[PDB]
Curated annotation (Swiss-Prot), chain A:
Protein's name in the database: Proteasome subunit beta type-2
Lineage: Eukaryota, Fungi, Dikarya, Ascomycota, Saccharomycotina
EC numbers on record: 3.4.25.1
Main location: cytoplasm
Subunit structure: The 26S proteasome consists of a 20S proteasome core and two 19S regulatory subunits. The 20S proteasome core is composed of 28 subunits that are arranged in four stacked rings, resulting in a barrel-shaped structure. The two end rings are each formed by seven alpha subunits, and the two central rings are each formed by seven beta subunits. The catalytic chamber with the active sites is on the inside of the barrel.
Portion of the full-length sequence here: 2 to 221 of 261
Encoding gene (name): PUP1
Catalysed reactions, semicolon-separated: Cleavage of peptide bonds with very broad specificity
Annotated keywords: Cytoplasm, Hydrolase, Nucleus, Protease, Proteasome, Threonine protease, Zymogen
GO biological process, one term: proteasome-mediated ubiquitin-dependent protein catabolic process
Curated annotation (Swiss-Prot), chain D:
Keyword Membrane assigned: no
Post-translational modification summary for this protein: The alpha and beta forms are probably products of the same gene with different post-translational modifications.
GO cellular component: nucleus; proteasome complex; proteasome core complex, alpha-subunit complex; proteasome storage granule
Organism: Saccharomyces cerevisiae (strain ATCC 204508 / S288c) (Baker's yeast)
Quaternary data: The 26S proteasome consists of a 20S proteasome core and two 19S regulatory subunits. The 20S proteasome core is composed of 28 subunits that are arranged in four stacked rings, resulting in a barrel-shaped structure. The two end rings are each formed by seven alpha subunits, and the two central rings are each formed by seven beta subunits. The catalytic chamber with the active sites is on the inside of the barrel.
Name of the featured protein: Probable proteasome subunit alpha type-7
Swiss-Prot record, chain F:
Protein name per its UniProtKB record: Proteasome subunit alpha type-1
Gene it is expressed from: SCL1
Cellular compartments annotated: Cytoplasm; Nucleus
Originating organism: Saccharomyces cerevisiae (strain ATCC 204508 / S288c) (Baker's yeast)
Remaining remarks: Present with 15200 molecules/cell in log phase SD medium.
Alphabetized InterPro entries for the sequence: Ntn_hydrolases_N (IPR029055), Proteasome_alpha (IPR050115), Proteasome_alpha-type (IPR023332), Proteasome_asu_N (IPR000426), Proteasome_sua/b (IPR001353), Proteasome_subunit_alpha6 (IPR034642)
SMART domains assigned: Proteasome_A_N
Curated annotation (Swiss-Prot), chain I:
Functional summary from the UniProt entry: Short-lived chaperone present in the precursor form of the 20S proteasome and absent in the mature complex. Required for the correct assembly and enzymatic activation of the proteasome. Also prevents premature processing of the PRE2 propeptide.
Gene: UMP1
Keyword annotations from UniProtKB, A to Z: Chaperone
Name of the protein in its database record: Proteasome maturation factor UMP1
Keyword Metal-binding: no
Taxonomy, superkingdom: Eukaryota
């Protein structure tokens, strides 16, 4: 049961012979990403959706092993949906964080998924970073990927406590744009998702083209 | 239910590792069941690479090295009168004095003989175990076991441990009514080869000059085996017939 | 210890004083030379007046702290408020029994009506030591002398605050893995008090 | 009805009235045991046991009918001897585990709850039977003196004075009288004298009987469980006789 | 009975296990099977219930099953349990051939089947096989016929001629009157004729309800067709 | 009478009933004790009758009200051993929920969890149901004041107010009359002391008897903590 | 070693009937009535929320969403239904959602629930479940569907059906009131009429539970931005809507 | 008999197994199913136990496809039959995966019969209360018709019936069946046998399930209600 | 109080360690035909070249459960782990479905996994000896 270890020895014998940002604003959170998907130096896809939905108001974006990121996100989404049905309550970002942290710690870093998770729940707005080995951290603004340094520079340039929705969207878009221009891993478009307290989540595909 | 309570009722025994039945048996705490196993229990280091551990710690000052069997020439062949087994009986010398003659041929039972090569301890231990298995089989079936069955038992046994570190090469020789005379060669790699003439050890090419015919008399066969061993080079001779093995000495 | 794992290059202090205990730390988390988070909160609460700081692997220490908090909730459901010694014992058992697979070090600061403020240190390996004050982290090595020259028993709250502020300011000054703001928790019979000091304040000491 | 026909041949079965008859039969077994009493004084506990006179072949110092669970906990039981020994062993194990874990002697209520949970767990499945013993235990902790009585059903309570065995009714009447006549409280030595008197009254008997008295008092034994020595035991016996 | 017959692990006051007897009673309701060994062959005969008008006969399983190229097996009792026993016997034969390079002997296979049947009587949560078996053949590199009988309790025996199943007492009496151990049938034809005549004592319709199988040394197993059995029946009737 | 194997285990009777469950329900009234639970604007109050006729008992050790977590309190109707068993199970469940999901367990979720365990007991042959009725109260951070009840049948449901015991019908009728008069589902008070006094008065009116400070136990749940009042607090509340 | 097994709790009678299944059916027949009606553009599922007057009706719901397009109701023993609903919700994800990326069609989830219920009759440790389920759903390639599942694990599709205490009269009414051209609103009205004859006490929106499988509901999705993301088709009518339909 | 019929693993003093006999008796309460094998195909027919017009007749209670070559008719408990049908489908796919060939009919029948026999030898298990009529084609024997019952025994047939009216249906089939029959004649014979043996006044289309295994390769055809109506009109029923 | 599983390596080996597949001809040797592993798999090869995470994953849930039981023993007493283990044993013992591999609902309720999914749930998964009777023999120990 579970993930299989068959053909491990056989594979050994045969061998022997992206910019993601999250920004908090006064009434919610925003997550943004680029749309370039590459297989080595070759651009495989110029319009790839990297923003994934754990739950209707909890979204995430990942880096590392793409299959691991997708699989872990989907498994946690299924667990979150079942838990919400069981408790008859809106899912909380803290619960998804706990599930992700314990699942990643169980595999001792062998599941290569690094995540930014943003969400809104009845307790408020939340933004978290999740490492492959199981460590998690909280922050007001986060960056991830090969273009994370340029995006973080932009975020450190123009971030403040009193940010409106429009200012937060513009700041996230500018950070993704900087990662697009200055990093070979990014470059095509900007996808945004805005989660505001008391309202539905707004998914803007190709906000900047 | 009270057994569960005892399992959850309390440290010292856990540190002694005596909460496990195998540890108690190995140290003869609860009795002598350790000396009552038809299949012996072999200890391995509880690590990820037991094989590398053993190979590193065996290939390195005092007399505590694993004894290696003689690489002396051994010959076995079959004829109408049975089987002739000849072993060059030159004895190596060390810091010891032998009480009597050292036998390089294991007498599995009054009807089966084996030849030592590689690890002396492996050959002796596993051929004694094979003799026990053959005795149990003959008691159960009320008939003498065929040579093929015993050789296959030994081959399966050594194959189950293939790659662990065992080193042995043996010739099982026997004369039964159904099969006639029969010789098999079994080594630690799992190979099991039926044959007519076997020459093993240094000088096997010279001893492979066996003048061989299926009409040789007993005396002619003994002389031929002695001469082959001398050409390879005293000689120890065994003549295996349907009634058992007979030791001549020469 | 694990390849490509987040480490804790912090500066941790815990000082016992006349009215209780104070736990202080910096707020810097780094990946090699890059600062991954400059406003991280390192003061972990495992019970209402039992707090800790962590060193070593971040994931291992977080898992251990979560298990300890769960254990203390179970204990509280039975016998009420646990003592600092009990929490330190649980931390020590978790660290020692898993020392071959997890890299973890914990400084525990607690207050209770019986013992009136205690500090325990569990370095790598899993041994436990009770001390009037404790320092830990990569930046602690630079303040071993200063603390030894400036600690007194039964100091007042303000004197303890000043001592911790000065020591952590020096640790931040000399250690590249330490920086940001200084965060402190004061545990006494009156309650729990949180304090923060900014670089423009402690850099002029 | 005291006999529930059709609902008393297996443990963990409810009768139409909601009763568990195997536990009640274990209570009946308890009620035929030797009389044992416990009295809670101002700052301690006193246990008293009536015992039958046995053969001279028994070693006098190796036959004690009052068990010590921990240095601060005393215990007596009425019913099946092996069940009492098993329960006392479990209590000693629980006390040792608690003291090892939390560096303090276990409080009496926590010990009582652990014993009660263990006893109650034996009324849940048909593969076991309820304990045939009622246990009177007690001691001194940081909160003061505590005396508890535990029944085969797993139910336990704290008591000012407790009694069990064949002569439970007379002993309970004497304990109620003692409580009524001492609203202020009672001291350890007065408790010893009254326990001797109550045991003598309850026994009043085939040929002869002996009396065992133990006590734990903060002022007398520094919060430790100790047997009553020769002088005090003789004084209590003389007071009970006259 | 008397309350002593509700479990396999209960001894009767006179020292009986009644459930074994009841399994034998179940065996007694099956069709008759006969085994007779001659000087150089073994013949197994079986009674077959009359086939229905609309019943397909091409793929209907035979009463005599080949465990191995040298060992055959017939049964009496519950038909469904016999399939499990036969499958286990075939697996064991192949396993022994793999482990020791040598095919099983008849006695070894009989002992294995008896061991399986004995094992299925050692638990209160399992039901014994209501089957009695006849195992026939020749040992490898040998020419001595072997015939064995196995019972639900796990007991096996060696017989020169034996019958099991419904009305087996009459066939056993006929065999006892018409069989001599010191002078067995010296030919296959004589053994087959004796087996057919024994089966005709309880078979109503006749030739179409008789199955005959012949085993010789060197792995020679033949299932006689309906024409040969009919010829034997006609010859027996003419000589009668 | 169950009249069959249902005298011991939980299987269907010919009428389609589970007699062991009904007998556990009957066992829930052994202690002959009544309990009441009401909701305020921002508090929940539970009051349990205490009967200590024996003079040798220590009253301070007699209680059927338990603290499950920081915010959840529980009242049990039935024998005290099963009550303590259920209390320990509920404490473990609440702590495990907090460890697994990162936030405090709500009262209704805990009630559902205990009800699922009771369903296990009703369906398994070798497990008996506990003969107790559980009432969990809290001030949930999403739902405000909350009362939920679970029974041996595995049924659980929430209440505006509740009463349990031999005299529960009269208390329930009085509560229904008061709620019909007020036309609200909760008590319109701002302090939990006033709610406690109202619940005491309601219990006194329903039972038709006067209560002293030692005859009752009171537990109060606020948004911060659940706590049990002592004798002095109840005596102060009585004077009004 | 007599504890390694437990004899079957469900056995055949000499007449050839499994007694425990029949008794579970009897327990189902003693439960509150629940009905289902299948229309051309939706399915209606209705039940009576029989209860104490001090119990909050909204806390306990006898209609449960299994998937965004599949809902269910029951007649019989509530706790068994709750356990089965939790299991069905989990199975919809374990067997289908994590494999094909889609929610299962109605018939396959019904089959999974039926298998779970059947396994309770081949057991020496548990007795069979005492509930009967009505499962309504919609799927792309089969349209709208309504199924009934019995305690034995047998299930059958229905145009309209009812279970519980008043099943026979409700079935007669549905037989006399069903046509192949019925609309969803007409089905809701017929369901209300059928439930009117069964409820003995107060018949309002606080004693009736109604759910529908109809068109997609974008307002219940919780997010916007993906045109191809269909909203849920399961919808539980509120008490106010039931009152409005009853008044009209 | 009451002292020897409470458990499946106990023999009676006469050597009988009462639980197995009761499981066999339970089959008589099921709807009738008939299988007829002609020279060029196999016909399976069955009668539903429908009592109301609210049942979805168009959308599968008696006829199932084990695979493209093998189908079954069911008489008995539906849920046990579904368990066994899923098991048989998995076994057939396993054989195809292992040998890269379609599984022979007899092997699948024997596997299912062994499972049902094993369910009569463990005290914690009750027998499956189902009977199967297997209709299949393989390259070894051609067209094949089998039956299996709760006891685990299976039999081969040319024409066979299971269910409520087995005796009368078998009598009619014996009086009417011929070896050289064709598929259409087999269809007519099955329909007439069902009509004669029915306890209802008329044999309408909504109370029937029909299936045919034939050749153009080998094709399985599960008849729709309209085709059932057309064949009923053609026959004259 | 373990977190990562420990003591996972085998300390002793023998040719008869797997009691369920022992050869009838030579009871000291395993039956390779009924093993159905391909026929060329000596036991020694299973002692080397294993993925280091396999043992951690295979024993993770048992380790967490044992830690929970130890915590209950420390805080509540012996009775609580005794009762949990008794309930789990009773549930697991009376479940015998030879045609299914899915766990029971009651087991998931006891394990607090009513609304939890892991990869073991998503991915739950011959010529000789894969029938009902082998499972009967293994269950009954005959």
């Amino acid at each position: 049961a579970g993930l299989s270890f068959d053909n491990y020895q056989r594979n050994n014998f045969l061998a022997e012979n992206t910019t993601i940002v999250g920004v908090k604003f006064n009434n919610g959170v925003v997550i943004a990403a680029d749309t370039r998907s590459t297989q080595g130096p070759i651009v495989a896809d110029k319009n790839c959706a990297k923003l994934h939905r754990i739950s209707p108001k909890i979204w995430c974006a990942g880096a590392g092993t793409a299959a691991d990121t997708e699989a872990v996100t989907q498994l946690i989404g299924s667990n979150i949906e079942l838990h919400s049905l069981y408790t008859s309550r809106e899912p909380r970002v803290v619960s998804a964080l706990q599930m992700l942290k314990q699942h990643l710690f169980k595999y001792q870093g062998h599941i290569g998924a690094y995540l930014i998770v943003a969400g809104v729940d009845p307790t408020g707005s939340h933004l978290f970073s999740i490492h492959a080995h199981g460590s998690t951290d909280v922050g007001y603004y986060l960056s991830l990927g090969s273009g994370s340094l340029a995006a973080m520079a932009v975020l450190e340039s123009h971030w403040k406590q009193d940010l409106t929705k429009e200012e937060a969207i513009k700041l996230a878009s500018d950070a993704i744009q900087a990662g697009i221009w200055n990093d070979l891993g990014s470059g095509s478009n900007v996808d945004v998702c805005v989660m505001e307290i008391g309202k539905d989540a707004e998914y803007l595909r190709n906000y900047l083209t | 239910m009270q057994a569960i309570a005892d399992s959850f009722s309390v440290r010292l025994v856990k540190e002694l590792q005596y909460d496990n039945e195998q540890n108690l048996e190995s140290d003869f705490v609860t009795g002598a069941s350790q000396f009552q196993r038809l299949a012996p229990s072999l200890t391995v280091p509880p690590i990820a690479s037991p094989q590398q551990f053993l190979r590193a710690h065996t290939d390195d000052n005092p007399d505590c090295k694993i004894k290696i069997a003689h690489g002396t020439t051994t010959l076995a062949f079959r004829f109408q009168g049975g089987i002739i087994v000849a072993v060059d009986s030159r004895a190596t010398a060390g810091n010891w004095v032998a009480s009597q003659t050292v036998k390089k041929v294991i007498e599995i039972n009054p009807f089966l003989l084996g030849t030592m090569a590689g690890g002396a301890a492996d050959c002796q231990f596993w051929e004694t175990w094979l003799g026990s298995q053959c005795r149990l089989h003959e008691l159960r079936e009320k008939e003498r076991i065929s040579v093929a069955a015993a050789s296959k038992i030994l081959s399966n046994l050594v194959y189950q441990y293939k790659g662990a570190g065992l080193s042995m090469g043996t010739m099982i020789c026997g004369y039964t009514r159904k099969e006639g005379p029969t010789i098999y060669y079994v080594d630690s790699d799992g190979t099991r080869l039926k044959g007519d003439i076997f020459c093993v050890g240094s000088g096997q090419t010279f001893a492979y000059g066996v003048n061989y015919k299926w009409d040789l008399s007993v005396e002619d066969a003994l002389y031929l085996g002695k001469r082959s061993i001398l050409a390879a080079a005293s000689v120890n001779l065994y003549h295996v017939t349907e009634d058992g093995w007979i030791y001549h000495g020469n | 210890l694990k390849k490509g794992e987040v480490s804790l290059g912090t500066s941790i202090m815990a000082v016992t004083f006349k009215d209780g205990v104070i736990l202080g730390a910096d707020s810097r988390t780094t990946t090699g030379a890059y600062i991954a988070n400059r406003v991280t909160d390192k003061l972990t609460r495992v019970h209402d007046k039992i707090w800790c700081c962590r060193s070593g692997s971040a994931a291992d220490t977080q898992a251990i702290a979560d298990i300890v908090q769960y254990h203390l909730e179970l204990y509280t459901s039975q016998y009420g408020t646990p003592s600092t010694e009990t929490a330190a014992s649980v931390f020590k058992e978790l660290c020692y029994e898993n020392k071959d697979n997890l890299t973890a070090g914990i400084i525990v600061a607690g207050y209770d009506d019986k013992n009136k403020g205690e500090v325990y240190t569990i370095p790598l390996g899993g041994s436990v030591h009770k001390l009037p004050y404790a320092i830990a982290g990569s930046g602690s090595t630079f303040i071993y002398g200063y603390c030894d020259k400036n600690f007194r028993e039964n100091m007042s709250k303000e004197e303890t605050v000043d001592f911790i502020k000065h020591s952590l300011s020096q640790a931040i000054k000399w250690d590249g893995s330490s920086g940001g703001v200084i965060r402190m928790v004061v545990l006494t019979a009156a309650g729990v008090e949180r304090l923060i000091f900014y670089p423009d304040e402690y850099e002029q000491l | 009805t005291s006999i529930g026909t059709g609902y008393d041949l297996s443990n963990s079965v409810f009768s139409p009235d909601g009763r568990n008859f195997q536990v009640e039969y274990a209570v009946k077994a308890v009620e035929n045991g030797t009389t044992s009493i416990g009295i809670k004084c101002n700052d301690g506990v006193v246990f008293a046991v009536e015992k039958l006179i046995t053969s001279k072949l028994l070693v006098p110092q190796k036959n004690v009918k009052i068990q010590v669970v921990d240095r601060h906990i005393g215990c007596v039981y009425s019913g099946l001897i092996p069940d009492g020994r098993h329960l006392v062993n479990r209590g000693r194990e629980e006390a040792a585990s608690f003291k090892k874990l939390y560096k303090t002697p276990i409080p009496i209520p926590a010990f009582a709850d652990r014993l009660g949970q263990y006893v109650q767990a034996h009324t849940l499945y048909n593969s076991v039977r309820p304990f045939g013993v009622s246990t009177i235990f007690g001691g001194v902790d940081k909160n003061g003196a505590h005396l508890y009585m535990l029944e085969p059903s797993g139910s336990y309570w704290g008591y000012k004075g407790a009694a069990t065995g064949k002569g439970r009714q007379s002993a309970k009447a004497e304990l109620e009288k003692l409580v009524d006549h001492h609203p202020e409280g009672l001291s350890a030595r007065e408790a010893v004298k009254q326990a001797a008197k109550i045991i003598y009254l309850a026994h009043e008997k085939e040929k002869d009987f002996e009396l065992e008295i133990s006590w734990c008092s903060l002022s007398e034994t520094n919060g430790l469980h100790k047997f009553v020595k020769g002088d005090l035991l003789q004084e209590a016996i003389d007071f009970a006789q006259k | 009975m008397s309350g002593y017959d509700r479990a396999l692990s209960i001894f009767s006051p006179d020292g009986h296990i009644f459930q074994v007897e009841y399994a034998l009673e179940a065996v007694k309701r099956g069709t008759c099977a006969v085994g007779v060994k001659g000087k150089n062959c073994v013949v197994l005969g079986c009674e077959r219930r009359s086939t229905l008008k609309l019943q397909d006969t091409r793929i209907t399983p035979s009463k005599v099953s080949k465990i191995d190229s040298h060992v055959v097996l017939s049964f009496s009792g519950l038909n469904a349990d016999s399939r499990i026993l036969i499958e286990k016997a075939r697996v064991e034969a192949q396993s022994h051939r793999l482990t020791l390079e040598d095919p099983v002997t008849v006695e070894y296979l009989t002992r294995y089947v008896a061991g399986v049947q004995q094992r299925y009587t050692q638990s209160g949560g399992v039901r014994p096989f209501g089957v009695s078996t006849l195992i026939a053949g020749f040992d490898p590199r040998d020419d001595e016929p072997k015939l064995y009988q196995t019972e639900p309790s796990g007991i096996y025996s060696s017989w020169s001629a034996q019958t099991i199943g419904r009305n087996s007492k009459t066939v056993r009496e006929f065999l006892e009157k018409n069989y001599d151990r010191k002078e067995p049938p010296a030919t296959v034809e004589e053994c087959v004729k004796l087996t057919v005549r024994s089966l005709l004592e309880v078979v109503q319709t006749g030739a179409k309800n008789i199955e005959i199988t012949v085993v010789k040394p060197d792995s020679d197993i033949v299932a006689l067709s309906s024409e040969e059995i009919n010829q034997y029946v006609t010859q027996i009737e003419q000589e009668k | 009478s169950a009249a069959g194997y249902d005298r011991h285990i939980t299987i269907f009777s010919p009428e389609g009933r589970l007699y062991q469950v009904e007998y556990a329900f009957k066992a829930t009234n052994q202690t002959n004790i009544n309990s009441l639970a009401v909701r305020g604007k921002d508090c929940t109050v539970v009051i349990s009758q205490k009967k200590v006729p024996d003079k040798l008992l220590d009253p301070t050790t007699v209680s059927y009200i338990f603290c499950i977590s920081r915010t959840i309190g529980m009242v049990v109707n039935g024998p005290i051993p099963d009550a303590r068993n259920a209390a320990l199970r509920a404490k473990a469940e609440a702590a495990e929920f907090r460890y697994k999901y990162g936030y405090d367990m709500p009262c209704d979720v805990l009630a559902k969890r205990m009800a699922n365990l009771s369903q296990i007991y009703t369906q398994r042959a070798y497990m008996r149901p506990l003969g107790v009725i559980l009432t969990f109260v809290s001030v949930d951070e999403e739902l405000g004041p909350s009362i939920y009840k679970t029974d041996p049948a595995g049924y659980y449901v929430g209440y505006k107010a509740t009463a349990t015991g031999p005299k529960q019908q009269e208390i329930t009728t009085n509560l229904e009359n008061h709620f019909k008069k007020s036309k609200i589902d909760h008590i319109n008070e701002e302090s939990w002391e006033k709610v406690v006094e109202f619940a005491i008065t309601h219990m006194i009116d329903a039972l038709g008897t006067e209560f002293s400070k030692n005859d009752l136990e009171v537990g109060v749940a606020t948004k911060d903590k659940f706590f049990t009042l002592s004798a002095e607090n109840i005596e102060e509340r009585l004077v009004a | 070693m007599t504890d390694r097994y437990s004899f079957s709790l469900t056995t055949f009678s000499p007449s050839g009937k499994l007694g425990q299944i029949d008794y579970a059916l009897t327990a189902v027949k003693q439960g509150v009535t629940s009905l289902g009606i299948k229309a051309t553009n939706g399915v209606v599922i209705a039940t009576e929320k029989k209860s104490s007057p001090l119990a909050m009706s909204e806390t306990l719901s006898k209609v449960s969403l299994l998937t965004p397009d599949i809902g269910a109701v029951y007649s019989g023993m509530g706790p068994d239904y709750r356990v089965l609903v939790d299991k069905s919700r989990k199975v919809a994800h374990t067997s289908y959602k994590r494999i094909y990326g889609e929610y299962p069609p109605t018939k396959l989830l019904v089959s999974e629930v039926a298998k779970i219920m059947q396994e309770a009759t081949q057991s020496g440790g548990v007795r069979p479940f005492g509930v009967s389920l009505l499962i309504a759903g919609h799927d792309e390639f089969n349209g709208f569907s309504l199924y009934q599942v019995d305690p034995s694990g047998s299930y059958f599709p229905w145009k309209a059906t009812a279970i519980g205490k008043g099943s026979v009269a409700a079935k007669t009414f549905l037989e006399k009131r069903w046509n192949d051209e019925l609309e969803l609103e007409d089905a809701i009205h017929i369901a209300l009429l059928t439930l009117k004859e069964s409820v003995e006490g107060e018949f309002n929106g606080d004693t009736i539970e109604l759910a529908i499988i109809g068109d997609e509901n974008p307002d219940l999705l919780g997010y916007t931005g993906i045109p191809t993301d269909k909203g849920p088709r399961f919808r539980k009518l509120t008490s106010q809507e039931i009152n409005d339909r009853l008044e009209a | 008999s009451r002292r020897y019929d409470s458990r499946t693993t106990i023999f009676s003093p006469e050597g009988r197994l009462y639980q197995v006999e009761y499981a066999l008796e339970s089959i008589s309460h099921a709807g009738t199913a008939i299988g007829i094998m002609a020279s060029d195909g196999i016909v399976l027919a069955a009668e539903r136990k429908v009592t109301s017009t609210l049942l979805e007749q168009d959308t599968t209670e008696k006829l199932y496809k084990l695979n493209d070559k093998i189908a079954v008719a069911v008489a008995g408990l539906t849920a046990d039959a579904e368990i066994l049908i899923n098991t048989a489908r998995i076994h057939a796919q396993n054989y195809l995966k292992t040998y890269n060939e379609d599984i022979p009919v007899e092997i699948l029948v024997r596997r299912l019969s062994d499972i049902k026999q094993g369910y009569t030898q463990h005290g914690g298990l009750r027998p499956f209360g189902v009977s199967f009529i297997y209709a299949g084609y393989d390259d070894r024997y051609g067209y094949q018709l089998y039956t299996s019952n709760p006891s685990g025994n299976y039999t081969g047939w040319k024409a066979i019936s299971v269910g409520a009216n087995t005796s009368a249906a078998q009598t009619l089939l014996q009086m009417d069946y011929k070896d050289d029959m064709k598929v259409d004649d087999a269809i007519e014979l099955a329909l007439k046998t069902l009509s004669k043996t029915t306890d209802s006044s008329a044999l309408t289309y909504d109370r029937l399930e029909f299936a045919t295994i034939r050749k153009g390769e080998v094709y399985q055809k599960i008849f729709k209600p309209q085709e059932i109506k057309d064949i009923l009109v053609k026959t004259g029923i | 109080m373990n977190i990562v599983p420990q003591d996972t390596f085998k300390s002793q080996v023998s040719t008869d360690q797997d009691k369920s597949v022992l050869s009838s001809a030579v009871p000291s040797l395993p039956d390779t035909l009924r093993q159905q592993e391909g026929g060329a798999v000596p036991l020694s090869t299973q002692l080397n070249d294993r993925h280091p995470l396999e043992s951690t994953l295979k024993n993770w849930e048992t380790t967490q459960r044992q830690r929970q039981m130890e915590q209950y023993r420390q805080i509540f007493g012996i009775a609580e782990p005794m009762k949990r283990t008794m309930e789990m044993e009773i549930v697991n013992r009376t479940d015998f479905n030879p045609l299914s591999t899915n766990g029971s609902i009651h087991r998931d309720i006891l394990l607090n996994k009513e609304c939890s999914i892991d990869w073991e749930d998503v991915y739950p998964g011959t010529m000789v000896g894969d029938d009902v009777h082998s499972k009967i023999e293994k269950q009954l120990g005959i």
